[model samples]
Target chain A: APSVYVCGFVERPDAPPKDACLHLDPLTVKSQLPLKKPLPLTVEHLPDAPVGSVFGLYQSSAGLFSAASITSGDFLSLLDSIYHDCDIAQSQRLPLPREPKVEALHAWLPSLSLASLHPDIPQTTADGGKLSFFDHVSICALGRRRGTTAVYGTDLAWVLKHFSDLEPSIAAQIENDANAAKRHPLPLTKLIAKAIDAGFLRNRVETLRQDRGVANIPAESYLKA
Target chain B: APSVYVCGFVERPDAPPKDACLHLDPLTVKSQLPLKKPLPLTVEHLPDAPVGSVFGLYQSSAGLFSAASITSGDFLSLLDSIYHDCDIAQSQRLPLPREPKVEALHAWLPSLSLASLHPDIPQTTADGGKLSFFDHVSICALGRRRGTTAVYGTDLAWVLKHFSDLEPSIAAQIENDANAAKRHPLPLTKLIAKAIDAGFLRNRVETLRQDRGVANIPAESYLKA
Candidate 1:
């Protein structure tokens, strides 16, 4: 199977697609691309969307999705490539419309093949199913299950809320989109953006794939740490 | 009407019955006093969410939403308190019944106000509006528009897609929610998650709010600077 790639020029304000003097294809962070003036038009074979870099997007056979932007911004396109671009059934979209489960998150995090069967590291009470994240320490690579990858700490929230399980208030003051109709994921989404920004997520996945979840891509890697 | 001083930002803790702001790391001892030490004055502020030690949050005139989580990952009431402890208006929730922004993402990056307002930057077509993030470079300070504050850089994705903005893929291969009704933010939603891991974002918000933004957070502290 041939992998798809794309590139375009990105500079101050705007630049035409054809005028893309510098084009960036996804570099899967295999070798650290140094910060340079003409930052090497080097494009790596994207096992998945290269996190945080900028580039145009083209599919295996399709012409192109759109011009380039922060690779972090184009997450969905990659999701399509990762999941084989197959549509998840509406029934799969909602196993139990009224009560969503972690499974619902699979639609969003296509790569995450299974939820934590870890019984109860965090809890087993009212909000235990989701709240279990707290009991864990780092949010680095946790072994994968069912062909999908599973990371923890912040990723947990992405799972719960993605399926509309706004629960277990740490403090009453904190607000949540309790509205059943409007429950969406929040910081976790942003969490992935920055993760891609610094190749944190991509790096984690890459590293885990290489070493089988042996390496720990600390969370601070995305922040100033 | 005693005002609470959080991060030299001059925010009220208890006002008009309104209070918010999370006090994560401060230079202090671990007593019952609203502060604790190791205050970890750690430097890891990105823009999205911080992935570091946890602390108590407070707020005021800004209608401080809710309290702090065990850590950034603890967002959403652990998923619950992660949201505003309130509800986004239906308009604020979803205007188009057919499509929904990652409004559900608020539960993650609680501070982010509105979604992408800018239109272009890195890319002209696909991610123009959101890609402009690169133009802003530094993650020093953010200005809120309506009732919320809008900060840029990768963090926006964390907020936007932390749970929504599944996205609008330009091609069949760059698949987004094929079912328009099941839209979700892609990269940003993921952004917030990573931010919560490394504390890049949390640390940035933490430092700027504490150290007078002197750290001069440049967003890409993760890369070779």
Candidate 2:
């Protein structure tokens, strides 16, 4: 098994040429990388499509430098733009202004509002009910299942409504999707750009990154001996 | 608010002078660092005692290189020994045989055997029941709480009994401990060296690390579109 070193810090605005190296064992990747097809180069290995495609994965004197290109989605474009900025910064030996965009995105996506077991796309509930992008994130973030029905935590339920963009009325819809009455594992589908680009969703994501779970919990409860 | 860059990769067998650096903002520490009291320097920021104590923390050309000393526990001794091996390896330019002790320990601890919300120590159930270190891990690993009763998943319960060193009869004891009728929010205590060094527990920890949680689950279920 050949170990190909990829630039792990491709997203880091301040990473020097030497500090950005990462070893990528093909087996390390969760998805099968077909030689010809464009596969996503993600911020982290996740269940969903990485916001961008690997434009090139070639070896250099430094190692395997993965150049990524964004096909669509403002989020993906944000990453692509950061990579270009980093490249210029490296060449000119000028410091690039580090945007918290990647940091902000990482913290936001994993949050219950947008987190998903399914990819960052459109989905359907177990029932025939079609899911909004917000609903998809909610289902994935639902607490635990007792028997057939997935139950929500009181704390988690409060956080979703007060801290995130998820509408209160949507809980009924999500419950409909999660009901034991429907097909056991409901199949999901692709999402629209509008869902990704929605201003309300973006604002909610930023807010959640700053104030999401555990942040609200007092440290003394867990920290005290 | 001074930033203290404690050495992060003291456990790395092959880190060079430059690569092993870490930024330790004082606020970054979850536990309060008393100016005079000794603080444990951790492998990673965790809820429990770091395996070793900071022998000295001071500034150097290479930032803050933390020198750690093992006070007790074979596990702590293992980490202390790794630091010595790394130090010698760094000075002599000879590659150390990277024993996967740290890696193994990290993987094993979090896998339902020894993990805890309380410090890595002994505990008592909400009732007057005194808990072994094993019992402490089980309670934290219990899937989710429904009302006052904490319920275990069939899969998690099976894994606990079959994959780990916890005794079968201990389940009766743990159930007794978990009974809602008992006083809630169990109080835990510090552990003995024997508990840390127990042969059966160590063997079980190693086994669980290789087969814990999602490691045994097929990737297709999550990866497939």
Candidate 3:
């Protein structure tokens, strides 16, 4: 009754649309969702470590739909300049993908930590509380930092603790993807989306969405403020 | 003269090719250059902040031409994952490049600093000295960190203090590029390359390329060792 649910249709490749929703404490979204201003897209609710923004919030048959744009930040510009210069540009002159150069980057990955990536992020607190577990997973996937493997582990840890019923399926999917592609497993973002969709397909309520009613109000008016 | 030079042709459109080179103190290259092993491409001679690798270093009619790959490290991966998600991916469902998302990233850029970007980099010292000014300029250009605007300024500062003759041209080029494209000016790397070529064209020594000789050995044998 006093919960904030972000509802949307989880995309399925060939099956019927699955209505999915992530449950958040009404308090959390209330502070972030300003009247007329957009909400910053962040990882694990770290306000300082924003990756993008959510433009609109709407309520539909499925549930609450959040229109958000998740940008990885200036890191993308740095990435493209290098890829364009080294791989794409170097292909014109060299035969390989610049092995030694690529190796250097691979070796350097483990050195980075989320703290180093976003030094401004404050430490998590008990009083502040957490949001729907799926939101963190989605944000982590949305704003990935190389060498920040801890993020992936932490998200799974949360899943195992709170959503016991959904944990195995998510873990199994992770393993499945790992088995399918040794180089690139299914990204955490897709895995969470799948798990969220499954949560809805089953009971829906356990996943935090069930014909939820928040005081009836115009969607635009509610979202704008 | 106990000096090493990396020579190459800097691209010049609609003009005769200008052969350019950057002089390096022999002691620096000696430590990094291994026999049959490639040298790591680095920034401002920082061994740790490697952007790429030099596959080959050869002496041609110009001077010493270094074949190198300058990858911008794991940051590129982090950057691309964000762009692909926010820009290209979001384009399918939205109209713009995700407005507040892109703006959020733009705001985050200044928060990043070089030390945070590469914690491994050590502080510079007087005893260690510096390389041909152009080398640092090119490397800085090759490996740019978004919030590290200081790098560009420091490079120009070096050019102004030492290479007085070429400083005006380099400074003017930066301004010209800034004027031509307000959003995307000529990158520092290209500007350095242009300056290096200009050095070769008029009284080369001012830009560090009156290179006479450095022991007559097979390019492979010397580079290998």
Candidate 4:
């Protein structure tokens, strides 16, 4: 399990001033780890309070938390992979505004600061070592009123980052489908025109570029203990 | 939804009386029904109560309660079907259990009674001839328990009854497997043997049939205010 230190201002007026800063004790941080590991730090093992009253450290999977938007982009990709394409027919498309480009997706992480990489980062081989990324990411969304919200993002960033290498089978399937359609030639432009006819592309290029919020970055992570 | 009354006896040594008669409200049984019309009550709905608690009445589709057990049996069949008949030169055998029979499988009434089933019963067919058994069984399980161990048996019972119908499909699959040896000819025997192996049969049958204190007859239909 990897660890991260999160800091953010809370908006709640009624909450205690101590609740404003982000804090991650071992117990609070350990819960977000994907692999089961005993809590290393008891109350006695905890360090003195950092500069902020709310500041704390957390133990979580590095792969899970490194995504730009845990709630919007990463979560949506996981959902699409699990509920839609993975098992059943993609019957119901999620009401996502539009798929964000990698460049646009990175804009959501304006405030997040990646922690300095520890020298003793553990290395584990997965899927025969064809590709490697973080296995899990844990986030703490601190609220002004609600205190903190803890959200766990896992495997999405790694999968997205290494999609070509990680999903060889899916790539093969896509290639097979493309080969089958070579002779007939898919009616790509016609389908887009039909979708526009159905009001799918209402404002043309302007609407397409607009951040409709469905796949936008989450405002913040859940508050850790 | 077709509602059934659940009657039982609770033994309380500390209470004023040694034995207390219990009465459950009318519960519209929910289950998956093959027919459009309301089916008659069958032995499948008679689920066994917990150790101290007596019998319970479950209203559900004639086949829904039985179907769950059938599905469990299907799980075993699927395991065998997948593992036993390897076309390659040699395949490693996976250790797994067989399917369960309808008679051997008993519903855990305690669990079903703890679930909540509110609102009016749903109507089935365009003319509203009768509600589906799935809906009725769902109501019985969902309506009984808010939070506690009181309803565990009933819930188990509801699940058992639903799976009973699934046994035949499981048997058919096993028989169709070309490479697997024919261990049993009768589908029902295969199912019973599987249920006995699963431990659900032993617990339910021993408690429901052997113990006189656990048995109680349901009440006749009554009008509600």
Candidate 5:
């Protein structure tokens, strides 16, 4: 069976542990045995994990676990920090004005859209499909703006239709955050199932253990493939 | 002695032969006799003439006569047709819409600064002079949506300073029907004198005329006093 890899950044002994990366290994559901069948997954950290880490998060649990965890006040603070870090990084590339005027902000949107669309990136799925990474990033950004509780079906549609090279069912499940919040009480399990089906979690397990900076891959990356 | 009676129209006639009751005897200015003594000034119309001959016009000499002519257009119109068979009645009062939406005709200026101070009658003059009957009439029928020619002076001070009376120097001149393009010039002699002495016109005459309507007083009356 074709397998996928998840690569990210972890802290090195020399560098101080910054909240730049998400440690996905601790969050992943470990299997009881190392299977002969390619483990059906592999996870790796990109050399530029810090930058990629700012982009998204990937997990093998039900989507609700992430929603509930992030919506909680303590996790919300961390999310805010992550958002701030991402914004700062984005600003470094395209420095925004301190007080962004409406006109100026409107002019910047197209460039931001273009920067998210750079074609050098590999397709995140094992099949290397034809989905655009920039569109996925935008969808995630829009989702973040909607916030956790307010995330609706339309919002999920907005994301799935714009991002991910997955089957329609995968897109449907990935987009339905509100449904996940309500029906899937155990989001971790549901997210794992979705990620496993989407080939995101099995790809990232090894990177979470071995790579110093693997955690830096943003959570939104999971929605890409 | 040759004389000309100047009359006021207290009540306007509804139809032809718009009769006006003369309030004072005609003022006599003798051309034949040399100036022996200055005549005492009085405000009185000539005594009643025959019903058919409501106005008195007589030539004392071939070279000179008591030329009882009004200086204002409305005044002249009133005098010319007062005894004539022609329908020289005043402008008819127009019925206004019950609930007008001045989207095209006028703009609703919800908060005018002078409105708060005066409430019912906002004085536009510096000294808070009462607006004349003409001024009141002009603004009364003004549609809310239509852009009014009414201009406010700087900080309302200019308005108060200039338009403080009924007889604004900047008066509106009516046009003659036969010569529709011709505008009867407002008599500038008195206003000019007043302005010269005071250093500025009492009111902004140019804008005032555009914003208000004057009563159809006989022009002869303006000449008499």
Candidate 6:
């Protein structure tokens, strides 16, 4: 409700880049807010902010993108000065979540616990509360300090995730893809270098929908996010 | 750096959450941010915020999770007021990409584009001079604002993914999980309901890993984040 800043992408059809921010006229927003559905002051994408183009996706009282700039390429990757995911830009990239750099903790499947996986993973309730069912399996999936999973989705842990929201069929579809992979497994080390080290798996999930017939992911998948 | 606040779910070795802002001469943080290898800042679960049990995960000058909180739980589902991903934290929740809620009006795959999917998914180079690929599959995944079928991930156009860090084995493993889910599919509606409404799937994945051999997920999974 307070003026929260979000990336502005879609423009207001009313004007070239409609000022849904509600200035100049009282009905500025409602006059332009068209989606048969209500929007939560969301942004479609960073309209544009090339490497050095200083930019900001400032949120207006209407929860829309205002105060624009033209810089593009991975909105998050841009330097703080180059772009800010803010309203009037509050801070720099110092405390933001960067794409993680994931690593592997040597542990066998059924026996791994969060403690054995990574040191930062919290296990006991508090010093000695009780041993929670810890597992770096998931935490590892989260990644390193620059962000979770220093590398985003390149670890065994990141992939095994089970989203309750995913369609059961879809989930199964993914599982099958995994099994297919095991049948003709890719070289783990090489896979890590290209796919994992570069986060090539994120896109393969979608190929299932379009191809709807393909099985496991190719060892040579593209590193698209 | 700045005293940018992040969620302090895991507790520190030296003090209590009395500082609500955590203060006890902060000898805090694991004496050793250890691992056979470095790690990414991820979490297995989203920690807690019990009424007023003060807590805070202050960002160090280097942007790491400092003075911790013992309210360990899933990371993303927690309210924004409770935490901010400051390029820190431990453990990982796999099925998430924090910045996805993106958008674009372009297409690349066999036959896909923003217009083909959601009309609200905007396109067109803002009356500007730059180029950017934007998608918000992440934003929709962070749903709860309103409406479920309100959006869908049928198109690869959903999120402008960038995965150059995932290994093929891991990706294949994830694919297997998806395939396995398909083995026993859940009604699309109910699956979305539980997952979208409660963040239920995160736990399910572990259940699979520990269960050792069970491959597919069932329709009766609980709604948990």
Query: For each candidate, what TM-score against the reference?
Result: 0.16, 0.18, 0.18, 0.20, 0.15, 0.16
Q: What is the C-alpha lDDT profile of model 2 across B1-225, one tens digit per residue? A: 111111111111121223312223223122222123444433222224344343333322222222223233555344334444543222321232343333223222222111112211111121233221111112111111111011112122332232122234443333332222122111112222322433334344333322322222221111000
Candidates' interface RMSDs, in order? 18.4, 19.9, 15.2, 27.7, 39.4, 18.7
Q: Is the docking of candidate 6 incorrect, acceptable, medium or high quality?
A: incorrect
**Winner by TM-score between candidate 6 and candidate 2:** 2
DockQ of each: 0.01, 0.01, 0.02, 0.01, 0.00, 0.01
Candidate 6 segments whose C-alpha is farther than 4 A from its true place: A1-54, A68-225, B1-37, B40-43, B47-210, B214-225
For model 1, how does the per-residue alpha-carbon lDDT over A190-224 read when each residue is reduced to its tens digit?
44563354343445444334321112222321111
Give lDDT per model, in order.
Answer: 0.23, 0.25, 0.27, 0.23, 0.21, 0.21
Q: Give candidate 4 misplaced runs (Cα > 4 Å).
A: A1-172, A176-225, B1-192, B195-206, B210-215, B218-225
Q: How do the residues A26-135 of candidate 6 rate in per-residue lDDT, one tens digit apiece?
A: 23333333222212111112222111111122123222222111122232232233223322133222344332211111000001001111111222133223222111
In model 3, the clashing pairs are A7-A64, A41-A52, A75-B79, A76-B79, A79-B76, B7-B64, B7-B65, B35-B224
Which portions of model 3 miss their true places by more than 4 Å? A1-225, B1-33, B37-225
- What overall lDDT, based on C-alpha atoms, would model 3 receive against the true structure? 0.27
Q: Could you give candidate 5's per-residue lDDT for residues A1-225 as a string of tens digits? A: 111112111112222233422111231212111111211110111011111111222232222112111122332232234344444223322332332211111111111101112111121111223222111111011111111111111133442332222245544453343343333122334323433543532433232222212212223322211
The ten-residue window of minimal lDDT in model 3 chain B covers B110-119
For A60-80, candidate 4 gives per-residue lDDT tens digits of 222112222222333234334
Two-way TM-score contest, 1 vs 4, winner: 4
| Number of the predicted model whose TM-score against the real structure is largest | 4
lDDT of 2 at A152: 16
Per-residue accuracy of model 3 over B131-202 as CA lDDT, tens digit each: 211222123321121111111111223212222112243334433332232221224463345335433434
**Tens digit of per-residue lDDT, candidate 6, span B165-187:** 21233333333322332321213
